[PDB]
Amino acid sequence: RWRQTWSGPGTTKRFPETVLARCVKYTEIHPEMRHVDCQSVWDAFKGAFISKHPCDITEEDYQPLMKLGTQTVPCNKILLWSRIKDLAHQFTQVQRDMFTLEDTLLGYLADDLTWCGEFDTSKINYQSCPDWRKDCSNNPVSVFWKTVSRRFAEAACDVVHVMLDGSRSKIFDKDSTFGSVQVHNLQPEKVQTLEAWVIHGGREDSRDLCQDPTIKELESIISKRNIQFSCKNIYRPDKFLQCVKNPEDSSC
Numbered sequence: 001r002w003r004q005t006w007s008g009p010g011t012t013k014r015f016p017e018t019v020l021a022r023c024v025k026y027t028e029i030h031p032e033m034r035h036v037d038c039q040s041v042w043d044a045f046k047g048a049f050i051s052k053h054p055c056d057i058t059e060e061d062y063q064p065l066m067k068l069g070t071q072t073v074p075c076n077k078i079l080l081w082s083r084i085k086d087l088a089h090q091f092t093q094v095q096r097d098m099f100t101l102e103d104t105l106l107g108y109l110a111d112d113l114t115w116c117g118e119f120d121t122s123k124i125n126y127q128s129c130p131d132w133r134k135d136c137s138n139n140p141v142s143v144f145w146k147t148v149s150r151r152f153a154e155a156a157c158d159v160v161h162v163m164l165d166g167s168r169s170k171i172f173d174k175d176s177t178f179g180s181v182q183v184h185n186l187q188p189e190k191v192q193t194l195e196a197w198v199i200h201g202g203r204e205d206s207r208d209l210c211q212d213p214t215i216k217e218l219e220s221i222i223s224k225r226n227i228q229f230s231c232k233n234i235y236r237p238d239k240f241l242q243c244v245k246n247p248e249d250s251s252c
């Protein structure tokens with residue numbers, strides 16, 4: 001076919017088998033989830049979007065899945081990020097200093113996948129799925145990430161960290177999930193401080209990106225929520241990871 005229904009990529013090939021297998025793997029490794037029934041998880045996940053119009057998805061659709069995937073993460077060790085997922089993952093994998101959504105069953109199941117169905121058939125659409133921008137915002141993937149991302153921010157306490165991509169024209173982007181959902185769902189009763197680590201992408205010696213107008217904007221928003229804001233430059237992320245791995249290194 002030379003023209004698809006929607007503008008976005010279709011469902012990831014073998015989506016059902018992949019989600020099920022990820023659930024088996026995650027629950028084998030993480031003892032706190034060792035009792036989860038992975039068939040039930042898949043059934044709830046499918047139930048969120050199968051036979052539903054893929055521009056008419058709501059947070060309620062995912063509630064059965066959210067309930068089954070209920071999981072505590074150490075509230076004071078949460079790492080959020082925007083446009084720099086790979087460094088976040090590389091850092092937490094060293095010694096589990098912090099936790100991202102992929103450390104949770106639900107984030108692990110969905111990471112890097114795309115999915116959608118069709119109104120009034122029970123088929124998965126492997127050909128195309130709605131684009132957030134061109135087609136609709138209330139699509140299966142966008143709604144999933146909005147819901148689980150809000151819930152993760154709500155779980156945080158004490159000091160919460162965020163890695164930001166300092167090579168972007170908007171280092172803090174109010175339109176990102178971090179900026180539009182997570183910033184507004186940190187609970188001021190519980191969260192003392194948001195600390196941003198601004199990750200440099202460029203040459204070597206460079207600017208203090210903690211003075212960037214978008215970072216001043218983030219500071220202003222967070223501060224007006226009665227949460228303290230702190231920011232640090234990470235000038236050389238390669239050195240940073242080396243120091244996390246081997247902190248006795250003289251150059252650290």
Ligand SMILES: Nc1nc2c(c(=O)[nH]1)N1CN2[C@@H]2O[C@H](COP(=O)(O)OP(=O)(O)OC[C@H]3O[C@@H]1[C@H](O)[C@@H]3O)[C@@H](O)[C@H]2O
Pocket residue numbers: 079080081082083084085100101102107110111112145146149152175176177178179182
């Ligand atoms: N696999 C994951 N994806 C996402 C997570 C997440 O935790 N894992 N997300 C979001 N997300 C989706 O991935 C793209 C790119 O985000 P990208 O544009 O790079 O950054 P965002 O700030 O939109 O989203 C990152 C922020 O929300 C959670 C995670 O806890 C981070 O603190 C965009 O559609 C997001 O909604």
